[PDB]
Design a protein around this ligand. Structure first.
Ligand code: HEM
Ligand SMILES: CN1CCC[C@H]1c1cccnc1
Length: 464
């Protein structure tokens, strides 16, 4: 008969007086200390059930998986996507788009050799580019995102972008500004009060324009692809989707139409660019702050692999310390703190509470990555979190940065391959120094909201 407890809201504003839009994660955690790991919060007029720590999140998303498999709102992205595409759909749409995308991703070689060689080759152009700097002092931002983007772009668009291409650069700028915006106070305030704020001047309009620009681009590529489409041989993800469109025109409740094509392709391009990009970014800063951890990775690379051969994905099994470090980077980086919002499909019973149909659910993925029962020093950067006393790699059940449950990151295979081979080919060739001193490096997040954004920095790439 009852909603979980939480602080008393006010009309329209909800729990505004208890939330700090600069630090929403620290706000919900603070309310947690008082109310328990399972509480109700009103983000303006939206009613939201928050789940903190491993047990509550798992119990929701794994044990009652089917009830918690809907999608709640992320307002900024909703403005553009409007319930279309894979990421921000629900019900029958998501289930259909999700299964298409997974099967197609498998068909383009994901988690197999075709994509390994494409990443290996693409990692080559990155080294080359990084040498083309001659150890000068640079922003690594768009060096990483150009290399990262090209992997998913081979798959969605059919071929890589050229690095000098001015439109490519413009797209990666759109992506980074959009994403960043969601991590700002204004972006979080935008989560409570969007119905008024969408009609107002400020940083949000900029975000809309970048998203529109990204939509403008995919929508053009598609018109192109439609006219040289060869139905028995797809060049790309766009082709595959267009073929499925034909096969299904005689079904009027099909999910396969133009609008879901544009939006899903956008999902992949955006998610397959900015996540790995940002994680590599954060990860570089972390290693520079911790140069002792940097040397053991080097040591372990020089012995399983060498100077000679390109690193390959299966090289990880014999490289326990490097895998611990990659996990610890993802663990500390905390890409999305509050996950993507969930919602219950139906009236649901959960631990003595009742959630009416339609209730938004925040599973706080950041609080699982920081759960004290699973990690000895949660707020520190410490590879030993993923190693035994033997130095073998150890799994954690709270390593959930890709989430869990019905709506899990189906990009996981790809990201993990990319994360591994990109971290490893770069450090094979380079060691990192910064203009700044290891004890003076700020590894605290620049922005925390929907995403976790590392501070702006510069570094140099010096050969080995
Ligand atoms: C640093 C790497 C990445 C992280 C930390 C990450 C994390 C996540 C998270 C937390 C979700 C939400 C899951 C949920 O709602 O419970 C998600 C979903 C999703 N991700 Fe990733 N991801 C990463 C890489 C990628 C890549 C490379 C792709 C490209 C194919 C991708 C595509 C997607 C899509 C389409 C969804 C929506 C799935 C759905 O709604 O059912 N992600 N990811
Ligand atoms: C970054 N992402 C991982 C989960 C959703 C996905 C995303 C976010 C915004 C726009 N498109 C895709």
């Amino acid at each position: 008969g009852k909603l979980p407890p939480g602080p008393t809201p006010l009309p329209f504003i909800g729990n505004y007086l208890q939330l700090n839009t600069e630090q929403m994660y620290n706000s919900l955690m603070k309310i947690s200390e008082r109310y328990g790991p399972v509480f109700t919060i009103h983000l303006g007029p939206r009613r939201v059930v928050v789940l903190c720590g491993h047990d509550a999140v798992k119990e929701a998303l794994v044990d009652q998986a089917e009830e918690f498999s809907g999608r709640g709102e992320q307002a900024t992205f909703d403005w553009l996507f409007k319930g279309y595409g894979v990421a921000f759909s629900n019900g029958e749409r998501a289930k259909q788009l999700r299964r298409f995308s997974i099967a197609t991703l498998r068909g383009f070689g994901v988690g197999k050799r075709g994509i390994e060689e494409r990443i290996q080759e693409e990692a080559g152009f990155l080294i080359d580019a990084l040498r083309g700097t001659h150890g000068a002092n640079i922003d690594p931002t768009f060096f990483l995102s150009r290399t990262v983007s090209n992997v998913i772009s081979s798959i969605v668009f059919g071929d890589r972008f050229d690095y000098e291409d001015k439109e490519f650069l413009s797209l990666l700028r759109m992506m980074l500004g959009s994403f960043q915006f969601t991590a700002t106070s204004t972006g979080q305030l935008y989560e409570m009060f969007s119905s008024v704020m969408k009609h107002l001047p400020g940083p949000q309009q900029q975000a809309f324009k970048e998203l529109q620009g990204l939509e403008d681009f995919i929508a053009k590529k598609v018109e192109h692809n439609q006219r040289t489409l060869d139905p028995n041989s797809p060049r790309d993800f766009i082709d595959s989707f267009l073929i499925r469109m034909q096969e299904e025109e005689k079904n009027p409740n099909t999910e396969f139409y133009l609008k879901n094509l544009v939006m899903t392709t956008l999902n992949l391009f955006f998610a397959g660019t900015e996540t790995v990009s940002t994680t590599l970014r954060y990860g570089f800063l972390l290693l520079m702050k911790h140069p002792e951890v940097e040397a053991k990775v080097h040591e372990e690379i020089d012995r399983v692999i060498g100077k000679n051969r390109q690193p390959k994905f299966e090289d990880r099994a014999k490289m326990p310390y490097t895998e611990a470090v990659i996990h610890e980077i993802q663990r500390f980086g905390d890409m999305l703190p509050m996950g993507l919002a969930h919602r219950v499909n139906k009236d649901t019973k959960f631990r003595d509470f009742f959630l009416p149909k339609g209730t938004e659910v925040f599973p706080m993925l950041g609080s699982v990555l920081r759960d004290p029962r699973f990690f000895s020093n949660p707020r520190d950067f410490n590879p030993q979190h993923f190693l035994d006393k033997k130095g073998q790699f150890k799994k954690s059940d709270a390593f959930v940065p890709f989430s869990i449950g019905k709506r899990y990151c189906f990009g996981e295979g790809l990201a993990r391959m990319e994360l591994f081979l990109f971290f490893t080919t770069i450090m094979q060739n380079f060691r990192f120094k910064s203009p700044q001193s290891p004890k003076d490096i700020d590894v605290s997040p620049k922005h925390v909201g929907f995403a976790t954004i590392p501070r702006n920095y510069t570094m140099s790439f010096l050969p080995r």
